[PDB]
């Protein structure tokens, strides 16, 4: 059922198949910045203000510097109040999606879901439908990365945000366990620092060459992003473009997060995988071409959701 | 109730009063191009299809050729059936609107109308709110334009598509009267044809310099357009952009529109004025900026609207 031609495919790795880095958890820490000693992860709590309306979307149209003058991105920022009650990791299709295999538009995984806001969510096999990296959709263990080493953002069940790299067993950890968690590609902020020199350590073999992986942070393209702020706000960011002609490259992107004062951050899927969908209708311009015209532009058929719904028998 | 700063002002004639050309409907007959003779008007049947949906909504991101290489421009086409009776024309805040001199954003006049697609419509005084030209809403006369000439577009009862130069008796016209009609400036398409210089002739005095009627159809920005196709489908068109740095200029648009099959089409309001809502949710980016932050942009308070909704008094 695809939706798109997947023809803006900005891809980290070589071939699909083989995501992430093959080296071990033990050399994320012994490579990282010293600074951070053997802490491969930052934590931060979730703000629990129940505040109206629980998410705020933010339209931009900002400039950029580049060599050949200026460029402009079109994109939205959009602040998530209690997190621990309203974000959630959805599977494609609904519940039990991963295991079949399953890619949908994000209109078409929250039908019924009743979702305020949504974007695309983590990296998926674009020929077969595998899903990428650990995955906790509303509490429950949906898949694991088997220790594969990517930027991972979750909730803990106190309301604790987690980001960063994780090894296995603080995945699986049955003690204040992950509520919500889902894998990206480079931690783009760490404690307010960009951290993109830093991902390419941590997220990229050494005994590859530095081509396929730079070129995914260099190239400019569409790019979406969860961080978080100093009160605990979830920001859920994306920027519309074209691989290599339109948006951001993760080293503008990280400055751009920074600069507006997010403090931890990591990649998403970005390129023609980028979608926002606000109240069940498209509200950004995806970057696939449709199936069935070649100048229209159509959503991708993708795989996780990020969700952004009312709270959970909370306020009835 | 200002919502945006407007700040992204594509004005066609200074001050902004003294809207519309003063000549004589006389002359407009007189200096138009002879192929023509004294039709100053175009007409064309309404589709009478009852095909599902109502309106589809089509994403583009193409690129135009500029001096400094290529520019690409954001925007949508939709595709209207049965505009006889899916198609309106509301008065800011609703009935009565323009009397009051009311603006509001297209969220908030389409609020309990259950419009599928919404889109800015005719033009009107950003300092006192009171609405310009012809305006026939939903079968009834709100206003006229006492033989102001500027680019029209109205259906009448009988399911014609009028484009063009209409005299004030043809608007007041009892027998198959208008039953929606609004006003635009430029008439972008004439039966197929880019009409942009036949337009700076009627809808400019030549008294005037040739200098701020020049700026408004060279400048780029943002823009809106409502024209049909061979098939009687109305198109409800729109391009983001920001006066003289994004967008297209109506030479511009005007092929555009052309290239893709468009008959007629007559300009209608752009610039921070541009405005697209699809089932109630802003799908476009305003160049205008929030009243409350200066980097984020906020729709504009404008004044009519052009509605799409479902057929009245017919599936049920
Ligand atoms: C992670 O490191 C901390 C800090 O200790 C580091 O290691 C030392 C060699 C020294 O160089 C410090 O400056 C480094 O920052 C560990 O903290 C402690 O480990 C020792 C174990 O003998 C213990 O005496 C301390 O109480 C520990 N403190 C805490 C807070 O744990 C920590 O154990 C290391 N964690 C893991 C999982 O290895
Ligand atoms: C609009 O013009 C048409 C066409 O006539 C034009 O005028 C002539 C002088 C000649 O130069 C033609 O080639 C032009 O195109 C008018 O058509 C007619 O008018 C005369 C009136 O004496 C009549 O004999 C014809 O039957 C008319 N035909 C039609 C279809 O009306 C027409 O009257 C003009 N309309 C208006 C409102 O002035
Ligand atoms: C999605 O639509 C809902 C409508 O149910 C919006 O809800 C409200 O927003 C207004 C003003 O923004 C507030 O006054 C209401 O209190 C909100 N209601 C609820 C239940 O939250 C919501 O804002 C929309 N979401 C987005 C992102 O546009
Ligand atoms: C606005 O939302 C409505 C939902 O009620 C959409 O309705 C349908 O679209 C699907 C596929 O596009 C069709 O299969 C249905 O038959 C449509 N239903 C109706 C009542 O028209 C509608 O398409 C949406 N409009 C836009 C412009 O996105
Ligand atoms: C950091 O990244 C820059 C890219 O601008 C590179 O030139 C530099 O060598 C990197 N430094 C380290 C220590 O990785
Ligand atoms: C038509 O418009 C062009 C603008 O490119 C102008 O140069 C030309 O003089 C115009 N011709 C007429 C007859 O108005
Ligand atoms: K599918
Ligand atoms: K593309
Ligand atoms: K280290
Ligand atoms: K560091
Ligand atoms: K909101
Ligand atoms: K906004
Ligand atoms: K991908
Ligand atoms: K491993
Ligand atoms: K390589
Ligand atoms: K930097
Ligand atoms: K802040
Ligand atoms: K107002
Ligand atoms: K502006
Ligand atoms: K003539
Ligand atoms: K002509
Ligand atoms: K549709
Ligand atoms: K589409
Ligand atoms: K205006
Ligand atoms: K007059
Ligand atoms: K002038
Ligand atoms: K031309
Ligand atoms: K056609």
Aim: charged share 20%.
């Amino acid at each position: 059922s695809r939706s798109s031609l997947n023809d803006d495919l900005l891809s980290p790795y070589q071939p699909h198949a083989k995501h992430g880095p093959s080296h071990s958890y033990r050399h994320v820490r012994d490579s990282q910045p010293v600074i951070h000693g053997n802490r491969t992860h930052e934590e931060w709590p979730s703000s629990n203000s129940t505040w109206m309306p629980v998410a705020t979307t933010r339209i931009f149209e900002s400039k950029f510097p580049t060599t050949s003058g200026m460029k402009t991105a079109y994109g939205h920022f959009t602040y998530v109040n209690n997190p621990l009650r309203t974000f959630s990791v959805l599977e494609p299709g609904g519940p039990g999606g991963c295991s079949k295999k399953l890619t949908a538009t994000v209109e078409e995984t929250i039908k019924h879901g009743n979702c305020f806001v949504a974007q695309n969510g983590g990296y998926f096999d674009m020929d077969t439908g595998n899903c990428f990296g650990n995955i906790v959709s509303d509490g429950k263990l949906v898949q694991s990365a088997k220790g594969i080493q990517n930027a991972q953002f979750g909730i803990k069940s106190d309301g604790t945000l987690i980001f960063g790299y994780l090894s296995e067993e603080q995945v699986l950890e049955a003690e204040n366990p992950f509520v919500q968690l889902l894998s990206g590609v480079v931690w783009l902020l760490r404690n307010g620092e960009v951290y993109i020199n830093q991902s390419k350590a941590a997220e990229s073999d050494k005994t590859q060459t530095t081509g396929d992986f730079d070129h995914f942070i260099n190239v400019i393209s569409a790019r979406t992003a969860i961080g978080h702020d100093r009160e605990g706000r979830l920001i859920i960011f994306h920027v519309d473009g074209q691989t290599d002609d339109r948006g951001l490259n993760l080293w503008e992107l990280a400055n751009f997060l920074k600069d507006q004062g997010v403090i931890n951050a990591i990649n998403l899927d970005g390129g023609g995988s980028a979608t926002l969908v606000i109240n069940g209708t498209l509200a950004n311009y995806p970057s696939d071409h449709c199936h069935y015209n070649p100048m229209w532009r159509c959503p991708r058929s993708i795989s996780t959701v990020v969700c952004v719904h009312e709270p959970f028998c909370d306020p009835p």
